[PDB]
Each structure stands twice: as C-alpha cells, then as structure tokens.
Design a protein around this nucleic acid. Structure first.
Lengths: 51, 78, 103, 108, 94, 108, 94, 78, 103, 51
DNA sequence: TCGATGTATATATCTGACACGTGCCTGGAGACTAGGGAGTAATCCCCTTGGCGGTTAAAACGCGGGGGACAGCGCGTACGTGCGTTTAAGCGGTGCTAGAGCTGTCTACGACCAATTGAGCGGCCTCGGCACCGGGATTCTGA
DNA sequence: TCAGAATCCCGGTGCCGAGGCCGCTCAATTGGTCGTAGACAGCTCTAGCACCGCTTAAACGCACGTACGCGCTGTCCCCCGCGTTTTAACCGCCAAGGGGATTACTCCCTAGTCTCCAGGCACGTGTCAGATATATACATCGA
C-alpha cells in the first residue's frame, strides 16, 4: 500500500530511480520508474519486498 | 548456517572441468553463486506461482518443467 | 627424491573424465538447503514441501545451464587469446546472451 | 424492453470488454471463458497502455512535439528497464537506436 | 467497403486520460495496435496452457492473475493485479 | 456388426491416430479437426521417432550396451544439423556434454 | 490407479521396427515421451496459428504440410513431408 | 553486376557508424553480405510457405511479421 | 596552408548524427533487387507480387537486426581491447548468439 | 527422387558428410547425415535443391 | 630419447532394476445430419513493368599519414597441486503426518437463443505541426 | 589558444497527413435457461520430513612455478578522410493491365450420437550392467 514511499527511500540509499511525479487528470501510475538497469551486473529486488 | 555458501568452490571447479577450463581466477566462486542465485530466483518464483495456482503445498516436478519451458530453455525426461 | 609433473595437464584428464561421465556434479544436501532457502524468500517465509524428482530435475537443469554458459564464457575468453579465465568473460557472455537467461 | 448498457461502462473503463470477450470466445484459446476474465484483460491492458503513453508523452514533451513519433516510443521502451524486459525480443519500425556510446572511445 | 476493426479510438481515449493536450502519429498508432494484439495473444496463450495444466475448461480472473504474475516482470505485476482487482470489484458492484 | 480393426491398422502404422485425434479434440486447437491431419501427425511422428532412435541405436552399438542410456541420445541429437537446430532450447536429463575441446588448448 | 498416459508401447514398437535387437532405458523412455509431446504441441500450435491466419476453422493435412515445412529445417522436412504424403496416399487408398 | 553486391560498402559503413565503430577492416564488406543473405534466406524461405498456404501469388507484410515471429524476433507497426 | 582533422573523430560526429536520425540507411532499390533475387531462388524462378509496404517493413527489420548484431560484435571486440573491428569479432558474436540468430 | 545419389556426389566434391548405409529390415532413412557443422561460417544448401 | 609411473583400458563375477504375461476396461470403431469450406467469378485497385529526365546524393581512387596491432621480451605475479588433517554428507533405516489424489453432490454459471444501438469504416477538411529553407548562434584543431 | 570550419537553434512558409466529424449499420446486450464444471467434503495412501550412525571425498595450504599481462618500440599498414570524378539510384509520373480480395452463391462432405469391444495399462520375474578384483599399454616428465 503506502510502502512505495518507503521503497523509494529504500532506493534513495545514490542510484538513478525515477520517482513518478504528480499531476491531476492524468493516469500517472504509482509504478516506480528505473534506470535502464544493465542486467549482467545490475542490482535486483532486495528491498522492495513485503515482510 | 548462512547456506548461500553451500554451493562450494570445488563443485564450481569440477563444473568448470566439465566445461573444459584450463585455469580460472578465484573470484568466480561468488560470481557463479550470484548468477545461479538469480537464475534460481527466476525459475522458482514462477514454479511456486504454478503450485499456487494448483493451490498445492508441495512443489511438483511437472511445474518446474513448465516454468523453464515458459522461460525458454526446455528440458525433457520429466 | 620424488619428482613432479606439470600442472593443468592432469586437469585435462578430469575434463575428459567429466565429459565421459554424465552424472551430477553438485552435492545433494547443500543444494537442497540453498534451494529451500528461496521459498522462504517467495512464499512469505512459510516454506513448502517438494518432490525429490523435482529436486533432481532442477539440479540437472541448473547444472546444464551453468556448464553451458561456463563453456560459452571460456570460448569467448579464448577469443581474447588468453587460456585462463576471468569473471569479466562471464560478464560479457551473460551480457551477450540476450534476454534468454533472464526472460 | 429495458435499456441496455455497455459492460465496459458498467466497469467504468475505456477499453472494450464485449469486443475483447468476442475476441476471446472466438479466438479459440480454451472453451469456457468466464465473465471475470475480459474485464481483468481490459484492466491490465489499460494500465499497460497508460504506462507506455505516459512515458511516451514525457519523451515527446522534451522535443516539444505534439504528435508522438515512433522514436519516442523506442526511447521510452529502451530507457525504462522494466518494459524493455517485456519487449526484449520486439523491434520498432522507424524507432532507431538510443544515444548509446561506449565510454573509453572518447579521448582525453 | 470492407469492415475491419482496431483500437485507435481506444488509444485516443487512453491518451486523454494521461495527456489531454498532445497529438499522435499513425505510425505510433500501428505500433500500439500491434502491441496490444501481441500482448493479448501472448497472455491468452499463457492462460490457455495454464488452464490446460490444471484440467479446467473454464478460465476465471484467477488464471489471468497468475498469468500476468508469471509473465510480467517486476512491479508491473504489482500494479497490474491492483488494477485488475480494483476493476473487478468495480464491475461486480453491478 | 463389424470386425475389430483400428484406424491406425487401417493406416497400417504404429501410432494411434484415434488417440492423436482425441488429443486434438481435448487440446483446443480448433473446433473441427479434419480427417487426414491426425493421420499425418502420427506419420511424421513415426518418422521422427525413427530418426532419433536410428542414431540412438547406432551410438548404443558403438558403446555396446543393451538398453539406451540418454548419453547416447545427447550424443545423437548433437551430431547432426537439423535435430540440434530442432532442439536448441532443449537439454537432456543425464545426457552430459559432448566431447568437445578447443584447438589452442592442446599443448604442442 | 485410475489412468496414466504415455506412448511407451508405441516407442517400443517403433524401436523393434527399426531395431529388433536392442533395448531402451526408462529414462530414455520418458525422454522420448516428453519429446513427442513437445513436438506434437509445437506443431499443433503452429497449425492453429496457420488456420487462424486464413479463417479456416477446420484443420486438415494441408495445414500440416506448410506447418512441418515451417518448423522443420530443410531435408529433414523434405523426408518428413514425403513420409506424410506416402502415408496419406496409403490411408486414402484404404 | 551481381545482385548480392548491391549492398554498398558506404551503406555498410552507414550501418557501422549507426552502430558506432571507430575503425573497420575492409574484409567485412562481404561477410556482412553473407550474414544478411542467410538471414534473408531464413525469413523468405518461411514467408513463401506462408503465402503458399495463403495460396496467393503475393507476399503481404503480415506474412513477414509471422516469419519474424517464427524466427523469434517479432516486429511491431504492421 | 590548408589543414584538416584527425581520423575517427569526425566520423563520431556522423555516429552521433546517425544515432539521432531514425530513418532507413539502405537504398530501397538495390535491397528490393536483392530480395527479388531470393524469391526467384525459392519460387522456382517465378516472381511474386511483392507488396511495396512489406518491402520497407523487411528493410527496417533487417536494418535493425544488422545494427544490433553489429554493435554486439563491436562490443565483443572492445572486450578484446582493440579499437577497430574484424570479421572474427562478428564471427564470435554470431557464434555467441545461439539459435536466435539462426531460428 | 533419385537425386540423393546425385546430391551425395554433389557433396562429395572434401567434406565430412555421412551417407546413410544400407541394411534390410531396418528403417534406414535416406535422410542425409552431416558433420556437426559449425554455423557461423558453415556451408549451406546451395546444391541440394531441385531446379 | 629411453625409462619410471600413475593412469584407463581389458576381464571375471555377482548381484539387482527392467521386459513381457494378464485381466480389464475405457477409450476407440460404424451410421447420418448440416451447415461451414471449396469453387466460380468479375471487379475494382496496387503493382510491376518501362519509360522519361534530372539529379544529386552517393561510390571509386589516391594519398597520406597517423595511429593502432601484433610482437616479443622483462618480469612479478597467483593460481595449480598433492600431500595432510578434517568434515559433513550422502549414505543406511524409521515413524509420520500432512497433504496429494478420488468420488460425491449439488449449484452457480457460460452458450444460445431475439433486438436494438452505437461505434468504427468513409469522405473531408481545416490545418497546424512540421519538413523544409535561409541565417545566425555554437565548438574541434593546430601553432 | 583560438580563426575557422563544421554544427545547433530561429524565424518563416507551403503542405499534406490528420484528428475530429457526420453517417451508418453490424455486432453487444439484455433475459433466461439449462445442462454441467467445479467447489467443497471428506477419505485414504504416501512421499517429503524430520530423526539416528558412518565413512569418505572434500578443505585449506603452500611451495614452487610459470604464464601473463603492462609496456615499448616498432613498423607498417591500412584505413579515415577527403577531394575529385563518375554514376546510377531516386523521384514524380503515365499507364496499364492484370491478378486478387472479394461477396455472392452453391453445393458437399466432416463433427456429434450412439453402440459394441479390445489393445494399452497396473502387477510379477530372470536378467545384463554397474561394480569390484588384476593388468596393462600408455601418456608424461627426467636429461
């Protein structure tokens, strides 16, 4: 639910993760937006999971 | 214990000899662990999604084959 | 006064052994423990039962996948004309895999 | 006779649902198609198109173009990490390639 | 005087739900039509083999939900299941 | 009434065209699956099974064993052009890897 | 104890049809059964796509000709299509 | 006057500088031709069977998209 | 006395030009000729009604495929730590493509 | 039809192409058998086609 | 080059996972609608010609020099390896239990029916981005 | 360091896809119903899921040691690059004519329905193949 505010701070802990901005009457999804994120050496989801 | 080091270094060495390696740097003992870990995290999430769709509390040998077949590296004999 | 032979050459005998043998190469129990370590990470901690046939199948799939990408990395490093191996060779080979090993 | 209504408006959505259920039941995928399937389809398709068009418009506003060129779609797809994984084996007519240069080719 | 069908008016409508101020090219329109058709047949094929795997001739939203879980990567699935569940709770009001 | 005689024996083959047509019923590939198409499927599967098992038995003769362990299958499918091209995405349970060494690896 | 499905009797039959002298492991038996199931579903999916592309809601041998020309590479498909034409001329005579 | 030689080396150099290459050997001007030739053979050999099943003496772009899908590199826009 | 620029560097200007221009890079008529050669090679010498918009579709598809494999080969050659390019680099990258580049 | 005798001779003209042998009561297909044939520089079917 | 020396390629035997028997059905063989699929078919419409002619945007050629590419050697390094303790794991068996499969039996629910209606093909038309053209802002390269 | 030549905005200008826009008429949609897929109950075997000993291949480890990658001339060669000189593809465009998506029609011949009925499918047993001894050519390092 509200963990997108937490996961964005968990991603701020530095790298290029595009936070979605806010404008009314637009769809403007809460999908967190990423760098192109080269995969052969990139990071993974280690901090966007719900315990 | 920490159990991520369970896939030990001479297992990687003998897998390299089956791959046919003369000489190999020591740093690979965690790089193979990382790529095997991300490969496992690829397949096992889809496999448990398959078992979840069967509402099954166990993992069945057909389901992992369906997961890798969806992944695109198919396997026979199961 | 014992004497020695060359390194590497008897490892090629192990290459010819492991190419002739078609059995597994990974111990059962640590692999089972590390693969049961991941349903903790995906089934909200509460783990699931398994099938031993499923364990053998995933064992074979992981072994074949890893040995294939490994020899791919070995030949791509041999394109760089050095008989030994580096992890950056694996970085190139997994990088020049396309979207196949990752979907 | 009672006045009818479109089931997408009964779902309050904009992608059609009766049309895609006609696409499903005659598209020969399975035999029995439940009522909850094509609304779930229309939901995820509306979300995906809203995603790609939002990134496309955020691309197009940077070049101040009112219309959206396929180069904008290509840059939005290959600039986002997530949808590029969805569209790895897909190419785009007249989309071009990203501005993508190796590091050490530049001199001092 | 032949009748076909496409989604270009639906693409134009969902453009207005995000960008009520911008235009659109027809090449991009054909890109989008191809895109929705491809992802539709892909997820339908996944749903069909899924329902084949559990010997169920029926397909509900659960099958589509697990299908987009297995097929779509990352938080796309997280937002998609919320979109779909919100839409079916919206539609099941009537 | 009639005399006991199957369609596959009326085809004179060794693969069940009735069971194949039963699969084409159940497998949801069309609503109508024609007459000669399961005949064609059983035929081409008979031929392809002959294609694999011929080289399988050849490899088993070259290793002198009664039954065929899948090492022979792996060596057979990876020693042609087409089946290796047919089974690029396929791996083998207990088939191992081919004897395959590189040119520069041989010392002198 | 209800029913299980395989092709193992047909595998052994075509085995003795090509080699009346040797045997087969059960591992190879499962390999072969899974192999023919995969080949069958792949060519059936291609046939369904093909019949979809020209709105022939039926599927006959004529789709299978172009299907096995599409999937199988080259002279393999040539021997296969001659095998299939020979078999359907055998069956249509009977 | 060979039709295969219609692919010109500055156009080969044009795709090269599209790929962004510092220097190229001149040897590639036929190797890329052979690669393009066998790739075109791969797609056209399936496309002609596609339109043969379509039983028309034309070749539509839908057939090309189907051939690219069978090759595994699907294409949009058509 | 006139004087002009270093090698390579103004070709990178054209590289930045072509990475910004999304248009086709092959002349349409030799490409149409060379694919009509192949359909004559497969239709027993007869020609078929080649749909003109299908031609540019295949043109763009082959162009995108070729620049993709081209930069893949340049990447593997730059892994080999040499600034230029050789056909052996393309040969390795073709070999380390799998059956995706062969179907 | 009979062109397999010609195509085998067309392939005999310094390569490792396994012609299938002959033994009765076996299937023993006329499918031409090949070297493993490395693909990135391999030969193709340029001479096993019907004109 | 000839010889010790640790392989693996022969060889005899000695158990134990497999292939045919076997009841037994449950899925496969004959008869007959009916209504989609093959066949005709003329008909407009794209596309393949061969042309124009301009033309200019591209190909060939030479120089030219400059800047990489092997090349080999110098040489510190780090991984190979095989003996030497060590460990844990793949062995045996042993409850056991929770959960995978099998019927049962209702019950909500998707095809299959008439009947409107709105929405996507079909000119169409501003029309405004926008491709395009002249012009004046920027930033590599030696002296 | 900085003319100077190559490129990035800046204003104007025809122009031509294009986004509403009106008509329209072919599939959604309400109702309902009716066999029926499956949801749920519940039961029963059974395969991981824990346990015990055991023993044996791994785990540092390290001592030489050896390839191996910086680096350096070097040289040479080949290849941007660039100007000049062909040159030939490209672009409107006529036309044409002809094959091909029709729709329209018009039969015809394969899915369901039902009734017999028998070849695949769960249980037993004599094996050849893995396993365990010699032994042995045979590659692999001394000088």
């Amino acid at each position: 639910l509200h963990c997108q505010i937490k996961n964005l701070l968990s991603d701020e802990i530095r790298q290029k993760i595009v936070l979605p901005s806010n404008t009314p009457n637009v769809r403007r999804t809460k999908r967190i937006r990423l760098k192109p994120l080269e995969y052969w050496r990139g990071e993974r989801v280690t901090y966007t999971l719900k315990p | 214990r920490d159990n991520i080091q369970g896939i030990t270094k001479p297992a990687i060495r003998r897998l390299a000899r089956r791959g046919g390696v003369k000489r190999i740097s020591g740093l690979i003992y965690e790089e193979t662990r990382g790529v095997l870990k991300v490969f496992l995290e690829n397949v096992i999430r889809d496999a448990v999604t398959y078992t979840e769709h069967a509402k099954r509390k166990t993992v069945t040998a057909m389901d992992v084959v369906y997961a890798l077949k969806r992944q695109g590296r198919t396997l026979y004999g199961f | 006064k014992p004497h020695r032979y060359r390194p590497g050459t008897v490892a090629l005998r192990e290459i010819r052994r492991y190419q002739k043998s078609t059995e597994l190469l990974i111990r059962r129990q640590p692999f089972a423990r590390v693969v049961r370590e991941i349903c903790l990470l995906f089934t909200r901690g509460v783990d699931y039962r398994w099938q031993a046939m499923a364990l053998l199948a995933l064992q074979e799939a992981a072994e074949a996948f890893l040995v294939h990408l490994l020899e791919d990395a070995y030949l791509c490093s041999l394109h760089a004309r050095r008989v030994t191996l580096y992890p950056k060779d694996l970085q190139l080979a997994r990088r020049l895999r396309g979207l196949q090993g990752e979907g | 006779r009672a006045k009818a209504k479109t089931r997408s408006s009964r779902a309050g959505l904009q992608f059609p649902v009766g049309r895609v259920h006609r696409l499903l039941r005659k598209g020969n995928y399975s035999e029995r198609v439940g009522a909850g399937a094509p609304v779930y389809l229309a939901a995820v398709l509306e979300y995906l198109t809203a995603e790609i068009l939002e990134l496309a418009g955020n691309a197009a506003r940077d070049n101040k173009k009112t219309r959206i060129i396929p180069r904008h779609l290509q840059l939005a797809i290959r600039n986002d990490e997530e949808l590029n994984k969805l569209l790895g084996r897909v190419t785009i007519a007249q989309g071009g390639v990203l501005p993508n240069i190796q590091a050490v080719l530049l001199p001092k | 005087r032949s009748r076909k069908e496409s989604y270009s008016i639906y693409v134009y409508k969902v453009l207005k739900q995000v960008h009520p101020d911008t235009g659109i090219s027809s090449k991009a329109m054909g890109i989008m039509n191809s895109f929705v058709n491809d992802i539709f047949e892909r997820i339908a094929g996944e749903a069909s083999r899924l329902a084949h795997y559990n010997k169920r001739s029926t397909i509900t939203s659960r099958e589509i939900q697990t299908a987009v879980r297995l097929l779509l990567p990352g938080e796309l699935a997280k937002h998609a299941v919320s979109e779909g569940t919100k839409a079916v709770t919206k539609y099941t009001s009537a």
